[PDB]
């Protein structure tokens, strides 16, 4: 990974 | 701990390594033919793009590393040997779990693995003979009017194997979905309910199967989400 | 825990993502013009170097990946969309911290962010129209007598974006220094005394913004050290 | 803790750092001389290969990065500066451990430190003047009938340094055993018994000295494993 | 390292 | 980072 786990966190926040 | 169940593992890995070695030897012997087969779509696309550009009014396959040609030959040979060792890798793996599949799943596993292998092969064939010839052209005609396509073999080989492997898996996931659905273990409700959760894990998988760029992660997650929707439709 | 303060975060992230998507759509629509704007300095430098070499007595922009042109166009479009979504990004970010800035800093933040944004844009403009045309030539004329400049768009886009972004930040740090100094929070004593510690963090920051090579780490730390000295002088 | 033994350490690194700086200035001033020496085998290999292809009936050294010509010149100068600082990097290193070697091991460390060092330069001189001219031609000739050798100077310098630096270590490792063989501390029984343990540690070293590709690790363990086997015969 | 430590585990397994 | 923190370590030794 690397700086892409930020987008994973974002998709969790966006999709609960 | 798990000391008694190690000798069989050692023997299985030894036979696996020997199989990979003999496959590598054969592949390095036939490396000229294998590399020609790999590079044929690129050459055809370059010729077509050149004809289009000339009609509107150069291109070649290059190597940017001194050992680039030898490294590419070795890598292609290693990949072919691994692929040529698939039957024996399955021979070693399946024989390892002998008592796990007592009488029923022992019978159920064989059609599943046979179907998965045949669908992976058909996916690779479809990717090489259909998707790539009509895609590589589109990938080269885009920059044909702004840049010059000096494609290096070192990156091209990796790109080509990535496309082939992915399209093989892309034709395997909606066959494991079929097997699991018709087996009755999983229904449509299970996959429909666990939709949001998939949203993250796919996005995690794309984070591991792509370079660190976020754009690559999105460009890999989108086809995976499309395949998840396809499986959603397929389960009945 | 922080459950009540999550719905606003979700809405802000959703609208920011939608803004980024619409920016990407517009940028991919205008990708031809955007790529021409990006590649104009390189073309001019190549033409000038070619004229110099011919007077002494070839060069072109290439793509080294099959999907290199498409990937470069997509990356440029994504970057432009992120930049095009910056005003709405700040719309969402500022609206998130509504009660933190009660009455005074609520009015002090706006001039600071406005000045930072305008100086970042002026720095990007200065880097594009002044630094790059007189620098790229020097970067190409240096090796014009030993090698042949076959510059790939895939690496050129990254290099140009990094230069533009860094020079924008390079003109922002000695404006946040000005804002902090004129605000009175920090004096000359604070920056002068805490000089040695900076030597560490810059070298750490320069370590995180560079490829793993040590030489480029030093080559990034040196301009940051110069900027720290410039800010030291600026505090008045 | 180790507070008293830090004041010397600070001063030891001070002359060490300044040693690299003065070497960098000397190396960069003569960067044309060093770069020509580095690229000489590549130029000869390309010309010799070109005669072979023409007889059977182009190639050049390129730069694929805008700043690659400057970066390669700086990287080559930086590497040369460190090597030019080798006599004085040991000046600080050896003088640091003053009381460790009281009277006896102080005498037997000097011949080892010069015998190993004098074999590293003989390794580089062997690699540049023997192995490389007959190996670079072979590598290019392998792909001379399928691809076009457009070798970038950015990726060539790293490849050349690894061969030169590595071959010196490849000629130093079977000298440390020779030095340790007559010292009497280690015998043949030590090597033969500790063979399987050497397998698991040589691969890990290979996994760290090569790109993440698995084939690269295997391609580095085999030359290093032969060196271990060579070390078996050396002890007597 | 990275995905190559698997080969290290393999060589330990094969060579005890 | 990676092998560059060694230089970062050095700036502490050189600059206390």
XYZ file of N, CA and C in Angstrom, chain D residues 32-45 120-137 156-157 159-168 171:
135
model
N 33.273 15.230 -16.855
C 33.381 14.764 -18.233
C 34.375 13.616 -18.351
N 35.488 13.688 -17.621
C 36.473 12.615 -17.668
C 35.926 11.332 -17.056
N 35.226 11.439 -15.927
C 34.692 10.251 -15.273
C 33.550 9.655 -16.085
N 32.659 10.502 -16.605
C 31.524 9.999 -17.372
C 31.983 9.290 -18.637
N 32.980 9.849 -19.324
C 33.517 9.179 -20.496
C 34.117 7.827 -20.165
N 34.807 7.735 -19.028
C 35.371 6.460 -18.602
C 34.277 5.446 -18.295
N 33.188 5.892 -17.668
C 32.105 4.979 -17.317
C 31.398 4.476 -18.569
N 31.129 5.366 -19.519
C 30.372 5.022 -20.714
C 31.234 4.470 -21.839
N 32.549 4.380 -21.647
C 33.414 3.863 -22.706
C 33.084 2.428 -23.097
N 32.925 1.473 -22.171
C 32.558 0.114 -22.607
C 31.226 0.044 -23.328
N 30.249 0.854 -22.917
C 28.959 0.856 -23.598
C 29.095 1.346 -25.032
N 29.879 2.404 -25.242
C 30.085 2.914 -26.594
C 30.789 1.886 -27.468
N 31.818 1.231 -26.931
C 32.526 0.214 -27.698
C 31.623 -0.972 -28.004
N 30.809 -1.387 -27.031
C 29.900 -2.505 -27.257
C 28.880 -2.177 -28.339
N 40.079 -4.957 -3.566
C 38.847 -4.371 -4.081
C 39.111 -3.564 -5.344
N 40.192 -2.783 -5.357
C 40.542 -2.040 -6.563
C 40.953 -2.982 -7.687
N 41.640 -4.079 -7.355
C 41.958 -5.070 -8.372
C 40.702 -5.779 -8.850
N 39.654 -5.819 -8.026
C 38.387 -6.361 -8.489
C 37.704 -5.448 -9.489
N 37.677 -4.148 -9.194
C 37.071 -3.190 -10.112
C 37.859 -3.127 -11.411
N 39.191 -3.112 -11.317
C 40.017 -3.091 -12.519
C 39.821 -4.352 -13.350
N 39.573 -5.488 -12.698
C 39.274 -6.710 -13.435
C 37.895 -6.642 -14.079
N 36.909 -6.106 -13.360
C 35.551 -6.047 -13.893
C 35.457 -5.097 -15.079
N 36.129 -3.949 -15.002
C 36.007 -2.946 -16.054
C 36.758 -3.354 -17.313
N 37.931 -3.962 -17.159
C 38.816 -4.209 -18.287
C 38.740 -5.626 -18.835
N 38.091 -6.554 -18.135
C 38.016 -7.931 -18.615
C 36.566 -8.372 -18.756
N 35.827 -8.366 -17.646
C 34.479 -8.926 -17.649
C 33.538 -8.069 -18.486
N 33.546 -6.759 -18.254
C 32.580 -5.883 -18.916
C 32.734 -5.853 -20.432
N 33.932 -5.699 -21.011
C 34.017 -5.681 -22.481
C 33.510 -6.951 -23.142
N 33.700 -8.111 -22.520
C 33.228 -9.368 -23.083
C 31.839 -9.754 -22.596
N 31.244 -8.970 -21.705
C 29.910 -9.258 -21.220
C 28.882 -8.272 -21.730
N 29.274 -7.002 -21.834
C 28.372 -5.997 -22.380
C 28.061 -6.280 -23.842
N 29.062 -6.727 -24.600
C 28.822 -7.119 -25.984
C 27.854 -8.290 -26.061
N 21.828 3.102 -16.747
C 23.085 2.425 -17.038
C 24.113 2.638 -15.934
N 24.143 3.834 -15.344
C 25.144 4.133 -14.323
C 24.956 3.230 -13.112
N 23.550 0.269 -13.069
C 23.935 -1.080 -13.465
C 25.449 -1.234 -13.500
N 26.153 -0.228 -14.019
C 27.607 -0.304 -14.097
C 28.243 -0.274 -12.714
N 27.735 0.580 -11.823
C 28.296 0.660 -10.479
C 28.113 -0.649 -9.724
N 26.952 -1.287 -9.878
C 26.696 -2.532 -9.161
C 27.649 -3.634 -9.604
N 27.950 -3.703 -10.901
C 28.911 -4.689 -11.383
C 30.300 -4.396 -10.828
N 30.737 -3.139 -10.917
C 32.077 -2.789 -10.459
C 32.204 -2.944 -8.950
N 31.269 -2.364 -8.196
C 31.320 -2.471 -6.742
C 31.128 -3.918 -6.312
N 30.180 -4.614 -6.939
C 29.921 -5.996 -6.571
C 31.087 -6.920 -6.866
N 31.739 -6.734 -8.015
C 32.853 -7.606 -8.370
C 34.032 -7.423 -7.427
N 34.241 -6.207 -6.925
C 35.258 -6.011 -5.907
C 34.958 -6.787 -4.641
N 35.626 -10.238 -5.210
C 37.046 -10.536 -5.115
C 37.614 -10.246 -3.735
